[PDB]
């Protein structure tokens, strides 16, 4: 979950 | 009677972070699904908000100390505060004359009736517009505007945060900067800090009302299918 | 030596369903995120494919007997066959002269290099273009084109289907119609049915290669975030 | 799961 958020948060 | 080097360094970092993540030319907006005036504005406003979430994430990553929080807390703060930061940062495009958000183009001018065509009601849009006008009337320095966005982001009283003490200490230092900045650098700002903290309360109320109305969109698949994956994630109810 | 009333009724229903779900004016395409020529074409092609999935669902719901399958089988057939129906139905916009898909506008003209700018490689695009040219060279009657899409959709040899016997019986009746139509109504079509069944095999191979390359997009969140919720659902790996 | 597909399939 929060796949995109984790990516954007680097 | 004077700001310290550490206080000024915080202001410089936050101003730079905002200038890096807010593009006054609005030229990227041509890449969104076009506006249409059935929820004819939902595709364009979904894309606008999704774009804006990415900018808020970029702004947050440059707030001193945010990057050092746990990943779960960083997500918790962004999921609860994203809509508030977007409402705050949109004031930079708001016009008291037009009573609308103006983004360098007539197709990218957003009035209240546009947002009704994305599934929202006057119960949200009337307080939202009154919020924008009151915030615009404060005539905040960009220093104060970016401090307020950072203070709003680093609020510990948000669902899901674990390290309340760490986030409160970060928010405390930002509040100290803002109070000192207003006192030294803002002529006649005796009542300003209190007004700015009031706006943070107003945003909480807009956040609640937006979440309620967003549940209706996300519960109807013909509307939720118009959203973006990022919007679905950030405004969704998943818990890490 | 002649088609029956039930065979003709099937053809009429399938032609009507295709005319209702394929708009030759392509005027809806202005609503997609615009094309850009970093995967600059992925937003526009995601929107095109998402739009096309909705049309394929609408076409499927009007195939005799599809509506009466279980919901799980209807989803199983659509998830496995959607990309194939889209490749098949796109032949109606393909030009042998331009070697490209042309949709009533230069911005909505798609060549091979456009699709490379959405994350795909020549390992998919070379067989895809050769498929389009060979299919166009068959000069199918619209009757034969819609029968082939329906036959492709109602294939029982797809992962996840439970009622193999029901779907095969539907596909059997459609194959009988197509064979009879070619024999009676298609001058010089002695070898046509065999060629059309070959194209169904080619589509299986394109399906596999597309699924492999789509996994790369969906495993990279900076790319999967550009997709639509419907695309994520239909091309995803969830099992009902 | 398949929230949108279920909706579109009526
Ligand atoms: C986003 C930004 C800008 C305007 C903001 C606006 C004006 C349009 C309506 C908006 C998005 C409100 C809606 C209630 C949101 C609903 C979302 C969903 C349909 C998913 O429920 C909230 C803020 C509002 C730009 O002009 C520019 O300033 C950049 C800034 O980031
Ligand atoms: C969709 C339709 C049309 C063209 C189709 C095309 C041309 C562009 C490239 C396309 C989408 C291929 C890509 C491999 C798909 C990748 C998708 C993803 C990036 C998610 O992996 C497959 C078919 C191809 C229109 O011209 C018109 O005929 C309507 C028709 O429905």
Ligand 1 centroid from CA B50, angstroms: 10
What are the sequence ranges of the domains in chain C? 1-239
Q: What are phi and psi of B11, to 5 degrees?
A: -60, -50
Give the CATH architecture of domain C1-239: Orthogonal Bundle (1.10)
Question: Could you tell me where the beta strands, DSSP code E, fall in C69-227?
Answer: 94-95, 100-102, 109-110
Alpha carbon distance C153, B160 (integer Å) = 45
Judge C/A contact: 3 or more CB pairs < 8 A: yes
Q: What are phi and psi of B176, to 5 degrees?
A: -60, -45
Residue pairs between chains B and C whose CB atoms are closer than 8 Å: 29
- Distance, CA of D3 to chain centre: 4
Does C46 sit in the ligand 2 pocket, CB within 6 Å? Answer: yes
Contacts of B232-240 with CB under 8 Å at 24 or more apart are: B232/C229, B233/A2, B233/A3, B233/A4, B233/A5, B234/A5, B234/B53, B234/B78, B234/B79, B234/B82, B235/B79, B235/B82, B235/B83, B235/B211, B238/A1, B238/A2, B239/B160, B240/A1, B240/A2, B240/B71, B240/B72, B240/B75, B240/B76, B240/B160
Residue in D1, D8, D10 nearest the CB of C240? D1
Find out whether C22 is annotated in a ligand binding site.
yes
Identify the residue whose C-alpha is closest to ligand 2 atom 3.
Answer: C90
- Resolution to one decimal, Å: 1.8
Q: Do C30 and B34 touch (CB under 8 A)?
A: yes
**Which ligand lies nearest the alpha carbon of C48?**
2
**Shortest Cα–Cα distance, B229 to chain C (Å):** 5
- B200 with B151: CB under 8 angstroms? yes
Alpha carbon distance C167, C160 (integer Å) = 12
Alpha carbon distance B217, B227 (integer Å) = 9
Ligand 1 atom having least distance to the Cα of B91:
28
Alpha carbon distance C99, B125 (integer Å) = 50
C51, with CB counted inside 10 A (0-12, 13-18, 19+), is middle
What determination technique applies here?
X-ray
B106, with CB counted inside 10 A (0-12, 13-18, 19+), is exposed
3-class DSSP state of B150: helix
Does B145 sit in the ligand 1 pocket, CB within 6 Å? Answer: no
**CB-CB neighbors (< 8 A) of A3 in chain C:** 221, 224
H-helix or E-strand spanning residue B101: strand B100-102
The per-residue DSSP string of C73-91 comes to HHHHHHHHHHHHHHHHHGG
Compute, in degrees rounded to 10, the torsion defined by CA atoms B116, B117, B118, B119: 60
- C196 with C141: CB under 8 angstroms? no
Subunits next to D (3 or more Cβ pairs <8 Å) are B, C
Q: What are phi and psi of C101, to 5 degrees?
A: -95, 120
Give the pair of three-digit tokens for residue C126: 């070379």
Pairing of strands C109-110, C94-95: unpaired
Interface probe for A, chosen from C225, C226, C229, C232 (most Cβ of A below 10 Å), is C225
Alpha carbon distance B70, B76 (integer Å) = 10
- B101 with B185: CB under 8 angstroms? no
- C148 with C199: CB under 8 angstroms? yes
**CB-CB neighbors (< 8 A) of B221 in chain D:** 3-4, 6-8
């Amino acid at each position: 979950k929060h796949k995109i958020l984790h990516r954007l948060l680097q | 009677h004077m700001l310290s080097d550490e206080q000024m360094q915080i202001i410089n970092s936050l101003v730079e972070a905002h200038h890096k993540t807010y593009d006054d030319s609005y030229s990227d907006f041509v890449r969104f699904r076009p506006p249409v005036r059935r929820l004819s504005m939902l595709p364009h406003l979904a894309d606008l908000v999704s774009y804006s979430i990415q900018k808020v994430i970029g702004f947050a990553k440059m707030i001193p100390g945010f990057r050092d929080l746990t990943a779960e807390d960083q997500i918790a703060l962004l999921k609860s505060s994203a809509i508030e930061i977007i409402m705050l940062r949109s004031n930079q495009s708001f016009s008291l004359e037009d009573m609308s958000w103006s983004c360098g183009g007539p197709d990218f001018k957003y009035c209240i009736n546009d947002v009704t065509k994305a599934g929202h009601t006057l119960e949200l849009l009337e307080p939202l517009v009154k919020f924008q006008v009151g915030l615009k009337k404060l005539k905040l320095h960009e220093e104060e505007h970016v401090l307020l966005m950072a203070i709003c982001l680093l609020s510990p009283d948000r669902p899901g945060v674990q390290d309340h003490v760490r986030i409160e200490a970060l928010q405390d230092r930002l509040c100290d900067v803002l109070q000192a900045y207003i006192r030294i650098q803002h002529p006649g700002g005796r009542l300003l800090y209190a007004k700015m903290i009031q706006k943070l309360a107003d945003l909480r109320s807009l956040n609640e009302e937006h979440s309620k109305q967003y549940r209706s969109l996300s519960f109807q698949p013909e509307h939720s299918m118009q959203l973006t994956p990022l919007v679905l994630e950030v405004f969704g109810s998943e818990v890490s």
